[PDB]
Design a protein around this ligand. Sequence first.
Ligand code: PC1
Ligand SMILES: *[C@@H]1O[C@H](CO)[C@@H](O[C@@H]2O[C@H](CO)[C@@H](O[C@@H]3O[C@H](CO)[C@@H](O)[C@H](O)[C@@H]3O)[C@H](O)[C@H]2NC(C)=O)[C@H](O)[C@H]1NC(C)=O
Ligand SMILES: *[C@@H]1O[C@H](CO)[C@@H](O[C@@H]2O[C@H](CO)[C@@H](O)[C@H](O)[C@H]2NC(C)=O)[C@H](O)[C@H]1NC(C)=O
Ligand code: NAG
Ligand code: NAG
Ligand code: NAG
Ligand code: CA
Ligand code: CA
Ligand code: CA
Lengths: 236, 186, 267, 17, 362, 121
Amino acid sequence: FYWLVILIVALNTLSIASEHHNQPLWLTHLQDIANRVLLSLFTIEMLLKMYGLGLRQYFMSIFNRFDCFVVCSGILELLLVESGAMTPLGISVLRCIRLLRLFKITKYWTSLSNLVASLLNSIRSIASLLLLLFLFIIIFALLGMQLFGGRYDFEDTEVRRSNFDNFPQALISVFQVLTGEDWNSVMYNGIMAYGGPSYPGVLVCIYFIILFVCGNYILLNVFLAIAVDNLAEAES
Amino acid sequence: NYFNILDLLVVAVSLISMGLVVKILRVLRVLRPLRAINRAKGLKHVVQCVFVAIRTIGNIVLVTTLLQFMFACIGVQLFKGKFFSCNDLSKMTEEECRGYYYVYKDGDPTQMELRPRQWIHNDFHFDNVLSAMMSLFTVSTFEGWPQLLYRAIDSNEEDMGPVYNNRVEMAIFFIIYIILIAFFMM
Amino acid sequence: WKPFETIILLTIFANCVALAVYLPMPEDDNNSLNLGLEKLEYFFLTVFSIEAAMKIIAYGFLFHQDAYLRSGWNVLDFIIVFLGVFTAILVKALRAFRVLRPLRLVSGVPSLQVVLNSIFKAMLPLFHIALLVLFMVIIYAIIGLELFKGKMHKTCYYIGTDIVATVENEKPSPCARTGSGRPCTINGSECRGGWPGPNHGITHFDNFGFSMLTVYQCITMEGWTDVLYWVNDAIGNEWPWIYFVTLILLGSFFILNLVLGVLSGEF
Amino acid sequence: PDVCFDNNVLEDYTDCX
Amino acid sequence: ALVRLALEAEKVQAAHQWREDFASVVYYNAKDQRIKPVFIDDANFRRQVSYQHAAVHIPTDIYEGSTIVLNELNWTSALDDVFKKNREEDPSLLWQVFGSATGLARYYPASPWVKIDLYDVRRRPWYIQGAASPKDMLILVDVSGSVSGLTLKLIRTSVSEMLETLSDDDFVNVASFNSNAQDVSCFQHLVQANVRNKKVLKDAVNNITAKGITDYKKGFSFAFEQLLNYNVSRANCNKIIMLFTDGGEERAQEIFAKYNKDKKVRVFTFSVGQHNYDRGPIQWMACENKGYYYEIPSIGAIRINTQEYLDVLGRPMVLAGDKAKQVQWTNVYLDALELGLVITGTLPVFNITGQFENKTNL
Amino acid sequence: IDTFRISSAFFRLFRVMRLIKLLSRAEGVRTLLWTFIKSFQALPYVALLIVMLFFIYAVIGMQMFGKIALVDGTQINRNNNFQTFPQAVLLLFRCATGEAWQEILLACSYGKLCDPESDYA
Ligand SMILES: CCCCCCCCCCCCCCCCCC(=O)OC[C@H](COP(=O)([O-])OCC[N+](C)(C)C)OC(=O)CCCCCCCCCCCCCCCCC
Ligand SMILES: *[C@@H]1O[C@H](CO)[C@@H](O[C@@H]2O[C@H](CO)[C@@H](O[C@@H]3O[C@H](CO)[C@@H](O)[C@H](O)[C@@H]3O)[C@H](O)[C@H]2NC(C)=O)[C@H](O)[C@H]1NC(C)=O
Ligand SMILES: *[C@@H]1O[C@H](CO)[C@@H](O[C@@H]2O[C@H](CO)[C@@H](O)[C@H](O)[C@H]2NC(C)=O)[C@H](O)[C@H]1NC(C)=O
Ligand SMILES: *[C@@H]1O[C@H](CO)[C@@H](O)[C@H](O)[C@H]1NC(C)=O
Ligand SMILES: *[C@@H]1O[C@H](CO)[C@@H](O)[C@H](O)[C@H]1NC(C)=O
Ligand SMILES: *[C@@H]1O[C@H](CO)[C@@H](O)[C@H](O)[C@H]1NC(C)=O
Ligand SMILES: [Ca+2]
Ligand SMILES: [Ca+2]
Ligand SMILES: [Ca+2]
C-alpha cells in the first residue's frame, strides 16, 4: 500500500486534469466511470484502515480525518446526481469538490508536518497585521468612492473599466493599485476626472501616492513579523 | 562545456562545407564566456550560499507549484470555453459573429469604417490544465491580471460572448489566489 | 461600565456598512436608499455626540490624554460644522471626512493599539534610506526638466484638421519635423505644433511638478517604458536611454536596500 | 388620411421582453 | 400590379417548411453560388439592366449565410415569375421591389447597385409609410444627473436617428424630464414633423445638459397631457410615448392607472448605454402598456433598434388583413438608384400560414 | 557665444550637479553611500552573470525573432525592435522589470509578417 495507492492517486490526478473544452465524446464518459471506479478503491483503502488499525487511532490523525471528508463527499456527490433533483448551478459545485483530492498526493512530503507548523505559526504572527491591512484598504476604498464616485463620465466610448462607482468595483480597483499593476492608467483617470491637468486638479495625484507608499509600507511590515517569527525557529 | 561548444563550432565548418544545422551550430558558440565565469572566484561564495538556502526552501517551492496546479484545475473547471469574445460586442455566439460591421471612430456616428468580424480568443484562456498554468503564471507575476481579471468577470455560458458586468463574484478567485501566492512568495 | 466599548463597537461597524451602501451618483442624483442613508447620518451624529459629551462629563479637558481619543472629538467636531453648512443650503469637502470614522474602530478595539504602535517604530532606521530616494527623485526631476522641456508638443495630425492620427492600438505619440524622430508615415498627415501629447496632458517634462510626477512613476518600474518611448520618439533615440536605465538601476538599488533596512532594526 | 388602425380586442401582447 | 405581388408572395410563403441546412440559393447579390449575367444599356432606366433576374441588396451589417436571411432568399425567388410577368403585361414599369422585415430587397430589373453603402431598406420612407398607420409620438428624454457620460451621447444620437423614421403625416414633440419637466424644443405642443420642424428638434436635443434627480411622476404626467390638447390639430391615431431613460427603481403605478385605464397609449421604453442600474422597472412599464422594451448597448445598435419599433405598430393592421390592403402612395423623393424624382406605391405583405384552417396561430 | 546651438544640452547638466554638493555636509547620508561603495565587493561578480544573461538571451532571440516586421500598433514596433543588438538588450530589460512582457510573447507567434527586406519571395 505504499505502491498500490500511488497507482490509484496518480491515476486520479490524471483523471481530474484531463479536462478539455470539447473532450470529443469518449473522454467525458471516462470521466464519470473513473470517478465511479476510483471511489470504489478509495472506500476500500479507507475500510481496511477501519478494521486493522484501531478505530480511535484512525480518526485521531489529522491527515486521515481529511481522508474521511474525501470519501464521504465522493459518495454524497454521486448519489445526488442519481437523485436528479439538483440545479445545474450545483453539479458544477460538486465537481469542484472532488478537486480537493489533489491533497491526497500530499500524504507525501516528509517535512509536510514541519512545513505546516512553519506556515501556520507565521499566520498567527500576521493575523494582527493582516487585519490592519484589510482595514487600510477599506478606508481608501471608502475615500475613493467619495472623490471619484462616478465622475468617470467623460462622454467617450473607451472602457474606463476600473471605475469606482460601486463598492466592489472600488475594492478591486484599490487592490489593483496596491499590488502595483497598472496604477498608471488609474491615476490618469482620477486626474482627468476632475480638471485634467491643471492647478487644483492634479492634486489628486496625492490620492494615488499615499495609497501606494503607505499601502506598501504596511505590506512591508508583514515582511518583518514573519522574519522575526521565522528567526525564532532558527535558534534551535 | 568546453568539449560541447567546440564540437558544434567544428561541425558548422562541416555544415559550411555542404552549402559551398547551419545557424544552430553558430549559436552553440555563445557558450564560451561561461568557461571564463568558472575562472572567477567571487561567485563560489555567492552561488554556494544560495544552494544552501534552496535546500531548506525547496519544501515551500514544491507546495507553491502545487497551488498553481490546484488553482489551474479549479480555474479550468470554472472558466472552460469562456473568454471567447466576438469582435463587435453585440453578437454573442458562434455562427453570427461573421461578415462585416461598422467601426465608429472617435466618438461620433459620421466616421464609419467597415472591418470584418471574427472570434477573438483571449490568448491566455483557461482551456487545458497546461493552458491554464500559462495564464495563471502571469497573474502570479502581478502583470496583466486586470485585463484578464476584468474579462473573467464579464463571462457567461459556454460559447457566448461577454455580458458587461455579469457575476463580479468571480473576482474572489483572482484575489484569494493572488493573496496566497503573495504569501508563499514572501 | 463594562460593555460601553461593545455598544460603540457595534455602532461604528454600522457606519462601515452605512458608507458601503452609499452608491455615488454623477451629477447630483440620489436613488432612494442613498436618500435614506443621508438621514441615517443624523443618528450617528447624535449617538457619537451623546457618547462624547458623556466622555466630557466623565473626566473633562484632561480626557484628551489618549491621542487616539484626541481624534475622537476631532471626527465629531467636523460633522457639527457640517450641520451648520447644511442649514446654509436651505459642501463636498466635509463629505470626505466621514470616511475617517472607521479609524475610530481602531481606537476602540485593542491589540490594534499594538500594531500601530509597532509600525511607527520601524520608521526610525528607514529615515536615511527614504531621504536619499527623496534626493534621488529631485536630481532626476531637474535633469529631466532641463533636458526635455517642451519636447513632446509636436503632433501627427491629419492634413489640416484637429484629429490626431493613430493606428488602431497606437498611443498618441509625438513627432518631430526635424531629424531623428518619427517620419510620421501614416499617409496623409503632417506634424504640426500644438498638442498630441502624452497620456492626456499628464506625462510632460515641463513645470517642476510634472517632471517630479513622471520620474516617480518611472521609479516604480510601472509604465517607465512609455516615458522612455515618448522621449525616444520626439528627440530621437541613442541618447535618452541612458537617462531611464540609470533611473531604474538606481531606483532598484535604493529600494533593494530599503527592504533590507527594516530587517535591521528588529533582528 | 381617413383609414387608421389601432387597438383590436385580440392582439395578445405577451412578447416585448 | 401590387395586388398581384401581394397575392403571390403570400401564396408562396405558405408552402415553405423552413429548411435549416443548405447543402443544395443562387440569387444575385447586387453589391459586386451567385450569378454574373448579361447587361443591356436601357434608356427608361438610364442604366444597365438585366430583365432576367432580380437583384438582391443585403445591407452590410448583416449576412454570412445566417439562416434567417438565407432562408428568405428561398421563398422570395418565386416572385421572379411575377416580376417578369408585369413587364410583358405593361411596359415602362420602373423598379418593382419587395422589401422585407429582415432587410433584403429583391428588385426587378436587376442592376448593379451604386465608399460605405449604408442603405437599410427598412428605414426607407417608402417602407415606414405603408408599414404602419400615422403616429402621434412623444419622446421623453431622461436628462437627469445619471445619464451624463456615454449614455447621454447615445440619446442625442438616437433621437436624431429616431426622428428620421417619421413621415409627413406623423407628429412629434421632444420633452425632457428631470427634477421637473419641460419641452426643450421651443414648441410647447405637438408639431408636424416636416423636414423643417425636425431640424429644431435636432438642435434642441443636441444641447441637452444633464443634472438633477429623476422622479418619473412629474415626467409621465406631463407626457399624457401633451397627448391631449385636442385643441392643436393632431392626427388622432397611434399614440406613442417613447422613453430614453437609463434606469431607476420606480414603477410609476399611480400614473398609468390615472391616464391609461382604457390602455390607449403604447409606451416603448429604451435603456441605453452600459449602466449598471436596474432594468427591472423599465421592462415593466412597456409590458403593462402594450409597449415593447428595447435595449441599446452602443452606437451601431441604434440603426437596428429604432426601426423594429414599427413591427409593434403593425400588430393592429394584421388583424384586419382583408381590408388593410389599401395602396398607400409616398409623396415624392429622390431614388437611390439615380432615376429622378419618383413616387412609390406600397402595400404590405402579411404572413398567412394557417388561415382558413385556422391553427394554434403562433 | 551663441548670442553673437542645440549641442549645449549636455553642458547644462553641469549646472544641475551643484545639488550633489548638498549631501557633502549631510553627514548621516554620505555615511550610507560610502557603505555601498565599500560593499561593492561581492556584488559585481553577480552582476557579471546578469550581463552574461542579457548577452546570451539577446543573441539567441536575435537570429530567431528577427524578420519580425516592425508594424506599429502591434507591440513589436520601432521603439521595441528585436532586430539590432542594443534594441534587443533593451527589450529584455523591459521583460526583466516585468513591463508587460506578456504581449511580447504574443508578438512572437506563428503568424506575424516578415519585414519586406528579407527574402521570403
Ligand atoms: C487623515 C485621513 C485623510 C482624510 C480623508 C479626506 C481627505 C481630504 C479630502 C478633500 C475633499 C475633496 C472634496 C471632493 C469634491 C471636490 C469639489 C468639487 O466638486 O469640484 C469639482 C470641480 C469640477 O469637477 P467635476 O467636473 O467632476 O464636477 C462637476 C459637477 N459640479 C458642477 C456640480 C461640481 O473640480 C475643480 O475644479 C475643483 C476641485 C476641488 C479641489 C480638488 C482637491 C481634492 C483632492 C485632494 C487630494 C486629497 C487626498 C486624500 C488622501 C490623502 C490623505 C491625507
Ligand atoms: C427553396 O429551395 C428549395 C431547395 O433549396 C426548393 O426545393 C426544391 O423543390 C423542388 C420542387 O418543389 C424539388 O424537386 C422535386 O424533386 C424530387 C426528387 O428530388 C421529385 O420527386 C419531385 O417531383 C420534384 O421535382 C427539389 O427536390 C427541392 N429541393 C430540395 C433540396 O428539397 C424550393 O423549390 C425553393 N423554393 C422556391 C419557391 O423556389
Ligand atoms: C385649449 O387649452 C386651453 C388650456 O391652456 C384652454 O383654456 C382654458 O379654457 C377654459 C374654458 O372652459 C377656461 O375655463 C380656462 O381658464 C382656460 N385656461 C386658461 C389657462 O386660461 C382652451 O379653452 C382650449 N381650447 C382652445 C380652443 O383654445
Ligand atoms: C497610402 O498608401 C498606399 C500604399 O502605401 C498608397 O497606395 C496610397 O496612395 C497612399 N495614400 C495617399 C493619399 O497617397
Ligand atoms: C393600362 O394598362 C394596359 C395594360 O397593358 C396598357 O396597355 C395601357 O397602355 C395602360 N394605360 C396607359 C394610359 O398607359
Ligand atoms: C443650445 O444650442 C442651441 C443650438 O446651437 C442654441 O440655439 C442655444 O443658444 C444653446 N443654448 C445654450 C444655453 O447654450
Ligand atoms: Ca510591478
Ligand atoms: Ca436616473
Ligand atoms: Ca507592470
